[PDB]
Symmetry: C2
Subunit: 563 residues, 2 copies
């Protein structure tokens, strides 16, 4: 139940199994390397036999080469499984995030989603594989050390297997106690840090009201309290390991005393006691690691639960089913009002605008509200809170999203150029339904083939980031070319600020009459030239419409039309 | 950095010396613990059978008690030094931050200054002190271990002091080689991660054009590349430790093979070789710890350099020296252009404005473009780029900043409340000057008797870490009381209340009557009732004044009155 991850890692069980075998060999390498001490001392520097010290360097090098090569094999295989489960997790996560509605993508998570794909998904497999290493390698180290101690000295091994659970619980209970103490001290330290934050935050009022003398005198007390809290934190942290080592040394002294008093014991040779004591020092580390393996694993699976919440989150609802291809019917807004998801202030009041068929009715004015969100409403980026958007005699909630978004083409300057070729970028998604002849025809009709064909290889060069890096005016032309692959009877034109693209601005306008040759066009205009050729103008400020005139007819209540 | 840091830590050299000698004793303790093996293997299981195995465990417990006590003493004393140097660093840094211009706080550095107060100031003492811990301790371990070898086996100790330079340079060079190998792979991983980010930042375009299939395919490609880069990165990272251990094992095997010669043997007892190889295995850690010493001290000095760059930055320009006590003169904005720091668009365009003394000149901006900056210019938060503010017949560059800020008083509902008494938050840096009777009179004139009675102790209640949680109206009434008590000749009413409450609203109205009846007030307004009561209303849009008259006078072109 706590995993919900085994199906994803199931196809790669071979890597886990071979990594476990490699780690078993890794632990056995150190176990045999410590077992070497008995021939090193008994057969070596005890009874004089130098022949055992001739091959002892060679067997040390052999076991160390085994240890290095099996450590690398374990790392490679466990990281291969981690890499492939990360690849599958990121693949599913990205496939689900692309389908998620943009309201989730808008300001709920914008830069941390890369961390979800990159950092948290890495952390899941990193912590899980670290836990598996720490429970296999170190567990087998404990088992091998106890086997060796049983084999060489079953008496001291019995004493050690009596106290090893005892010293394990002694480590675990004091670690938990001091970690809880450190958590309480951390909470207090965070409170004082937030007090310092509040001291820093009112910088403007310190300058006017009085000066820095009182603030410095109070920060002296706050920083002294921070210093005392830090000293107590590090004191509680540094009193932990000494106690653990002291209890481990109590166990060490008990084991050494088990060789002292019983005359039936102390039949060990020098090598046997050396091995059974080096086994204790080599067992201290696995005992310390096995106690903390569950915390690491639970951290990993907590990150994995965080990554699963996004994975199985609500996706973009596709309840509408009306399929539409080349709608000649026009869009109409009837008292539709939209509030931004995240806020409560309606940025768009009841809109009764009906944009006609084939016309170029624009929207004028920086409303700081749902002026731009009408574009989002046409393409169903943000679902309309109340009202109906009726295009071609049917509400947008009835249409299939895939068919509907094919009807609408969005032209802007903030255009995400996909990391592909120019031909694929201006024929994205439907890269096979348009052939390179259509690409050339649309580029020539876009008044944009001159610089595209100038661009290195032409239509087959790479347009992506860290590439040719076309400009914003050139991005307008590329988006217009993508729209001039047609199959988009609804045009929505952002127009940006129209920062003097000049012959490319004339390209935008010539291509705009080419688009509006048959397209129902809604322009969120910031250029008066588009207003001049606009057949109708509706001006919205602060989410409320003020006029529905037409340029010179609109000058009855001028306001800011001159500017 | 350390050259200029050392005076700061100089008064606390006693703690450094005590921690250093404690670490010397800790190193000596663990080396004596290793040295105890020679009695254990010679006078114990060796030639002399018994009469040492009660001495040995008792001395082991004593040495481990010494090890724990010395470790805790070193941790506490080095933490005391770290605390008393970080407290001085934080105090100096905060005293310089309070003196820096508001432009430094306003988006040149966000609330992460707290981190530079807390985190990057800690890391220095965390990196330096830890480096010292790893300098004095591990070196004293090294100086211990070789001596422990020299006392027991000079023959093997010569081989080991030949090799330990060789092993040290081998460890250092392979570590440098593999870190240099790893950082290039890290750069490539960052590049493909940025490519994945650019894939993520196209969600609107992908949804419009239905390229989720193409996006999933290209993300499969980039995620496979990411997985391969991760596998190569962890391979390069995990091929380092095996090579280090193999080189150390070559050194160990060479030592052990040299022990096989008759010249080295015939003097190494069972305990002598045991202590020699125990010293060998214990000598692994200090060398890597010295490499980590160099790395840690470099990182700490980098952080300290960052903090010093923050410390020695340019401060508030206090070149003016003219002192003003009661500024009864009219204020004048005369041909003034202000540009926001970090931006090129002038928030305030070149415009002229008179602020007659004793009059409530109202400044009206719906958008806020250049509205609130007029309040900031008088208080010299942001220095005026062009033009002079002729206050009382002199430029503010001539006036001393302290007196100028004493004359003016900013009033808003966004006023932050200091974590002091209400009697001290109502008089900041003036509670020692204005007596409690004046505090009572200010509370009486502030019409905050109900809210000051909501406080428990009343006049002397503590509004600390949001202890009382005064609301926007309550906070505005406290700031109003502060303005009354300080008796600022110039008032700047933010009027950010924006028609909230009634008793607080009438309190604001009556209190601004008490204030502005004998006090010039540059009011930026949201409530239109204040605008009607205002004498000279100045409508400001896009940094330029459009209409400078009365409500009925400039009703010819209302602009924003009907809103
Ligand atoms: C030219 C010269 C150069 C040539 C050199 C030749 C060497 C060739 C070998 C190649 C390298 C192999 C390294 C190795 O050792 O091989 C290890 C296995 C050895 C096989 C190698 C070949 C041997 C056979 C060949 C011989 C010929 C045939 C395994 C390993 O590989 O594991 C290595 C590991 N070794 C051991 O554990 C077994 C130990 C033991 C070794 C066994 C063999 C002993 C010698 C054998 C021959 C000698 C006899 C003749 O070995 C040691 O340490 C050295 C001690 C030597 C003497 C001890 C006893 C002597 C004999 C005993 C009686 C006979 C060692 O870490 C242990 C250190 O941690 C504590 O410190 P703290 O103080 O707690 O902070 C210790 N405190 C302690 O233990 C406590 C006390 O000491 C003693 C406890 C009380 C004793 C009671 C027993 C315990 C009871 C348990 C049951 C009851 C320190 O004190 C030291 O012990 C040494 C220090 O001087 C003190 C010495 C005094 C010791 C006691 C004296 C008393 C003696 C008897 C008294 C009469 C000690 O130094 O180092 C590497 C780095 O591991 C770490 C790291 O430490 O960073 C750990 C993890 O990190 C973390 C963590 O996550 O937990 C996070 C870190 O951020 C950090 O916080 C860190 C903290 O340190 C932990 O708190 O922990 C991990 O992650 C890992 C990571 O992968 C990064 O690499 O890194 C690990 O490698 P890695 O994991 O693979 O990467």
């Amino acid at each position: 139940t706590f995993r919900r991850l085994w199906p994803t890692i199931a196809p790669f069980k071979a890597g886990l199994i071979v990594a476990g075998v490699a780690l078993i060999l890794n632990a056995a390498s150190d176990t045999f390397m410590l077992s070497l001490l008995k021939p090193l001392l008994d057969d070596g520097f005890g009874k004089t036999d130098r022949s055992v010290l001739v091959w002892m360097p060679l067997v040390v090098i052999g076991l160390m080469i085994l240890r290095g090569i099996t450590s690398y094999v374990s790392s490679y295989c466990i990281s291969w499984v981690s890499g492939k489960v990360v690849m599958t997790m990121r693949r599913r996560l990205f496939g689900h995030m692309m389908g998620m509605p943009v309201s989730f993508f808008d300001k709920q998570s914008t830069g941390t989603l890369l961390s979800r794909i990159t950092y948290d998904s890495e952390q899941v497999a990193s912590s899980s594989s670290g836990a598996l290493i720490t429970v296999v390698r170190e567990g087998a180290s404990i088992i091998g050390l106890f086997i060796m101690m049983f084999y060489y000295s079953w008496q001291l091994s019995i004493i050690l297997i009596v106290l090893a659970p005892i010293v394990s619980i002694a480590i675990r209970v004091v670690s938990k106690r001091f970690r809880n103490i450190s958590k309480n001290m951390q909470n207090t330290m965070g409170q004082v840090t937030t007090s310092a934050e509040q001291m820093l935050k009112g910088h403007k009022e310190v300058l006017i009201f009085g000066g820095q003398e009182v603030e410095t005198k109070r920060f002296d007390k706050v920083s002294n309290r921070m210093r005392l809290q830090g000293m107590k934190m590090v004191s509680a942290s540094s009193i932990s390991d000494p106690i653990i080592q002291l209890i481990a040394s109590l166990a060490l002294a008990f084991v050494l005393y088990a060789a002292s008093f019983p005359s039936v014991m102390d039949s060990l040779t020098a090598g046997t006691i050396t091995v059974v004591f080096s086994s204790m020092i080599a067992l201290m580390r696995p005992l310390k690691s096995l106690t903390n393996v569950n915390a690491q694993f639970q951290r990993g699976m907590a990150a994995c639960q965080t990554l699963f919440t996004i994975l199985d989150s609500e996706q973009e609802k596709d309840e509408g089913k009306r399929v539409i291809e080349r709608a000649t019917g026009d869009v109409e807004f009837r008292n539709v009002t939209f509030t931004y998801p995240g806020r409560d202030v309606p940025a768009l009041r009841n809109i009764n605008l009906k944009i006609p068929a084939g016309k170029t009715v624009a929207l004028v004015g920086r409303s700081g509200s749902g002026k731009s969100t009408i574009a989002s409403l046409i393409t169903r980026f943000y679902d309309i809170d109340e009202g109906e958007i009726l295009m071609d005699g049917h509400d947008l909630r009835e249409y299939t999203l895939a068919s509907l978004r094919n009807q609408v083409a969005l032209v802007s300057q903030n255009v995400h150029l996909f990391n592909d070729t120019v031909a694929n970028n201006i024929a994205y998604a439907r890269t096979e339904q348009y052939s390179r002849e259509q690409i050339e025809e649309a580029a020539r009709m876009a008044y944009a083939m001159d610089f595209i064909n100038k661009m290195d290889n032409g239509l087959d060069t790479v347009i992506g980031e860290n590439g040719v890096l076309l400009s914003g005016g050139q991005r307008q032309r590329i988006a217009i070319a993508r729209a001039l692959l047609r199959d988009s009877p609804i045009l929505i034109l952002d127009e940006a600020t129209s920062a003097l693209d000049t012959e490319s601005e004339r390209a935008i306008q010539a291509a705009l009459d080419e688009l509006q040759k048959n397209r129902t066009s809604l322009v969120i205009a910031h250029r008066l030239s588009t207003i001049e050729k606009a057949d109708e103008i509706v001006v919205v400020e602060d989410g409320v419409i003020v006029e529905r005139g037409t340029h010179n007819d609109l000058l009855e209540h001028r306001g800011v039309y001159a500017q």
